[PDB]
């Protein structure tokens, strides 16, 4: 009965070493991802000061994207934004809007199917496998523009610090379908701008919102990848803590069993020798 506890000590010890390795590799990958994230945050600002920030629009069709992870040892990231995804789908919906639900990452199709099984329509995965580039976000945005909504909702985790990840909803309106209608306040706020494009302002807004969706999507899945790494860094730190607790209790148990083993094996020898002497 003392080789099962010994192999359990070996099991919990290699689990703890695996988990400390995972923690240190997530802490390294969080720092190399923080190079790319803080540079990509810049391009989000001109579109959010040019088009504003309008999350609760009365769109009759939206495409919602929950930016989830691929690997699953994050520790409650994808569940948190699935809660936020349905808590925005129960908020921005107003009149019977068609909502297309999309997920970026394998851990979104595992749970958005569990929430919105019928409105779920697209599943992007394997995106953080090599790296995240703007051509990749552009192709994903092209596949979202295959549908023609009046709004886009991007649900991602904004990497703020190494411990703080706030879920974020970033809204992109369709160019003259809803965006110009939300900018006119008795005249317009967009008619201050001298348009210097070739063709009409509807075409420059049609190009500009595709570019805004690609930028928002690229930054969203950079922020979510950095929060993924910094949340695996804390999930594999609590798991080393609990695998140290389990190992300490198992070592106390093993020493009790070792002492009891020596005592009973000695008492057998004394009882066998006292029957002869």
């Amino acid at each position: 009965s003392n080789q099962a506890v010994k192999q359990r000590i070996r099991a919990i010890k290699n689990i703890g070493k695996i988990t400390k390795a995972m923690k240190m590799v997530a802490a390294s990958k969080m720092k190399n991802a923080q190079i790319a994230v803080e540079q990509s945050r810049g391009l989000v600002d001109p579109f959010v000061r040019l088009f504003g920030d309008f999350p609760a629009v009365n769109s009759n069709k939206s495409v919602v994207v929950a930016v989830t992870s691929d690997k699953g040892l994050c520790g409650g990231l994808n569940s948190n934004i699935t809660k936020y995804t349905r808590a925005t789908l129960a908020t921005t919906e107003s009149e019977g809007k068609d909502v297309v639900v999309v997920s970026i990452g394998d851990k979104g199709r595992s749970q958005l199917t569990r929430i919105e099984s019928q409105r779920y329509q697209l599943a992007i995965a394997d995106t953080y496998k090599v790296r995240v580039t703007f051509g990749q976000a552009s192709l994903i945005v092209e596949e979202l523009i295959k549908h023609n909504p009046q709004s886009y909702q991007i649900l991602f985790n904004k990497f703020r610090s190494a411990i703080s990840f706030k879920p974020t909803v970033a809204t992109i309106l369709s160019p003259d379908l809803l965006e110009k209608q939300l900018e006119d306040v008795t005249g317009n706020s967009l008619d201050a701008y001298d348009i210097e494009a070739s063709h009409e302002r509807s075409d420059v807004l049609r190009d500009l919102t595709e570019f805004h969706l690609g930028v928002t999507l690229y930054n969203a899945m950079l922020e979510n990848n950095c929060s993924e790494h910094a949340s695996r860094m804390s999930a594999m730190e609590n798991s080393t803590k609990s695998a140290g607790e389990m190992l300490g209790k198992l070592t106390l148990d093993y020493n009790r069993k070792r002492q009891a083993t020596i005592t009973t094996e000695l008492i057998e020898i004394i009882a066998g020798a006292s029957a002869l002497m």
């Binding site: 106390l252 020493n255 009790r256 070792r258 002492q259 020596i262 005592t263 000695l266 004394i270």
Partner: protein, 105 residues
């Protein structure tokens, strides 16, 4: 260890001094009294030790006190057998120790 304690007890009782005693590896004192009890034919107690483990330890450790003449102080090196602080030899030894000084690498 009783011989070293007698040499310290002269300085305590007759000279009236504050003596140091260095029982190097009190665990080996325990081990040797365990072997003596085993050779004398006594039935061993818990894990493998003498039945008189607490009493053979307290016979030593109770003569290292402060008297009205002087005192004996012991810096006893302690060995922990299976890196097990609940083993009866360090568990019985720690009931007497008033301080621990851990030297680490």
């Amino acid at each position: 260890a009783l011989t070293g304690l007698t040499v310290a007890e002269y300085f305590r009782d007759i000279e009236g001094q504050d003596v140091l005693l260095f029982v190097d590896n009190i665990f080996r004192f325990t081990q040797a009294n365990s072997e003596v009890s085993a050779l004398l034919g006594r039935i061993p107690s818990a894990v493998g030790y003498q039945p008189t483990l607490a009493t053979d330890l307290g016979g030593l450790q109770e003569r290292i006190t402060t008297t009205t003449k002087g005192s004996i102080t012991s810096v006893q090196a302690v060995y922990v057998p299976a890196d097990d602080l609940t083993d009866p030899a360090p568990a019985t030894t720690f009931a007497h120790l008033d301080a621990t000084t851990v030297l680490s690498r």
